[PDB]
From a paper:
Glucoamylases (GA: EC 3.2.1.3, 1,4-α-D-glucan glucohydrolase) are amylolytic enzymes, possessing specific raw starch-binding ability through their carbohydrate-binding module (CBMs). GAs from Rhizopus oryzae (RoGA) posses an N-terminal starch binding domain (SBD), which belongs to CBM family 21 (RoCBM21) and shares relatively low level similarity with the SBDs derived from other starch-processing enzymes. RoCBM21 has been proposed to have a cooperative mode of interaction to sugar molecules, which are dominated by hydrophobic-binding region created by aromatic residues namely Trp47, Tyr83, and Tyr94 at site I and Tyr32 and Phe58 at site II. We previously created a circularly permuted form of RoCBM21 in which the original N and C termini of RoCBM21 were joined and new termini were created at positions 89 and 90.
Unlike most other constructed circularly permutated proteins, CP90 had significantly enhanced binding affinity and improved selectivity toward long-chain carbohydrates (i.e., its affinity for β-cyclodextrin is less than that for amylose EX-I, which is less than that for soluble and insoluble starches). The asymmetric unit of CP90 reveals a homodimer in which each unit is arranged in a slightly tilted antiparallel fashion. The RoCBM21 and the CP90 share a similar overall topology. CP90 crystal structure showed only 7 β-sheets while RoCBM21 has 8 β-sheets. The super-positioning of RoCBM21 and CP90 showed that substantial shift in the orientation of amino acids either at site I or site II had not occurred. However, two of the aromatic residues (Tyr93 and Tyr94) and one hydrophilic residue (Asn101), which form part of binding pocket in the RoCBM21 have been moved to the N-terminal unstructured region in CP90 (see the unstructured region in Figure 1). The proposed alternate binding path for CP90 involves the hydrophilic residues Lys54, Lys55, Glu107 near the binding site residue Tyr52 in one subunit that connect to the next subunit through hydrophilic core Lys97, Asp62, Asp65, Asp68, Asn69, Asn70 and Asn72 situated near second binding site residue Trp67.
Author numbering:
A (entry chain A), B (entry chain B): 2 to 109
Write the structure that this text describes.
Amino acid sequence: GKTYYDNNNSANYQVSTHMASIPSSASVQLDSYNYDGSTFSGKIYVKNIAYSKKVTVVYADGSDNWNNNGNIIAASFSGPISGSNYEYWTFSASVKGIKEFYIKYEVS
Amino acid sequence: GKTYYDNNNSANYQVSTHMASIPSSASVQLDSYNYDGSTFSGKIYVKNIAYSKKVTVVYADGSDNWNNNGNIIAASFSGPISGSNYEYWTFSASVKGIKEFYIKYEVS
Ligand SMILES: [Cl-]
Ligand SMILES: [Cl-]
Ligand SMILES: [Cl-]
Ligand SMILES: [Cl-]
Ligand SMILES: [Cl-]
Ligand SMILES: [Cl-]
Ligand SMILES: [Cl-]
Ligand SMILES: [Cl-]
Ligand SMILES: [Cl-]
Ligand SMILES: [Cl-]
Ligand SMILES: [N+]
Ligand SMILES: [N+]
Ligand SMILES: [N+]
Ligand SMILES: [N+]
Ligand code: NA
Ligand code: NA
Ligand code: NA
Ligand code: NA
Ligand code: NA
Ligand code: NA
Ligand code: NA
Ligand code: NA
Ligand code: NA
Ligand code: NA
Ligand code: NA
Ligand code: NA
């Protein structure tokens, strides 16, 4: 029954909003990702060019095999970026190994 | 008010631990799922029969098209089920429509 803290050396962590750098033209563009050895997760700018959207991450595993482009992670809508025509989509999945990827965006 | 509550008619919600009904033999078995018209999510029993695991949900969309078994959602490891040889994996994705699915479990 002990309590410990991380209060950034008694300063607290100071937050300002991370502003979007919305792509100049691309219909879909990776914002950021992290692979920590167990989880592959990230954030993706998605242009609101149609109501129905499907966004997926296609990847090559730990030995750089794409498995006929069959290693797939689905992204989820996170929310619109206010004042822009882009939205944030996020993804996160347990992944044993990953060497490369690209993003696929399907509109109807 | 500016603050509202749901306190179950002043009784509070009473939580009993939901005990696992581990499959009697299956290597992978759906526990539960929910589709609410926007999000398709759920929970899956996965037998710990090898260290390396990949668990995916393959589904047919809103007009019952499988797209050659190409509509894929990746599940993530949630935790072991204490005292059993099964684990919980979960999944959740934004999905426009879905009519059917099955689960695929790859060990290595
Ligand atoms: Cl610190
Ligand atoms: Cl990220
Ligand atoms: Cl639109
Ligand atoms: Cl995850
Ligand atoms: Cl109460
Ligand atoms: Cl009561
Ligand atoms: Cl569920
Ligand atoms: Cl659909
Ligand atoms: Cl069918
Ligand atoms: Cl185990
Ligand atoms: N996914
Ligand atoms: N409260
Ligand atoms: N309530
Ligand atoms: N309450
Ligand atoms: Na501290
Ligand atoms: Na300070
Ligand atoms: Na402070
Ligand atoms: Na990044
Ligand atoms: Na791998
Ligand atoms: Na592809
Ligand atoms: Na079964
Ligand atoms: Na269910
Ligand atoms: Na799989
Ligand atoms: Na448990
Ligand atoms: Na998922
Ligand atoms: Na069927």
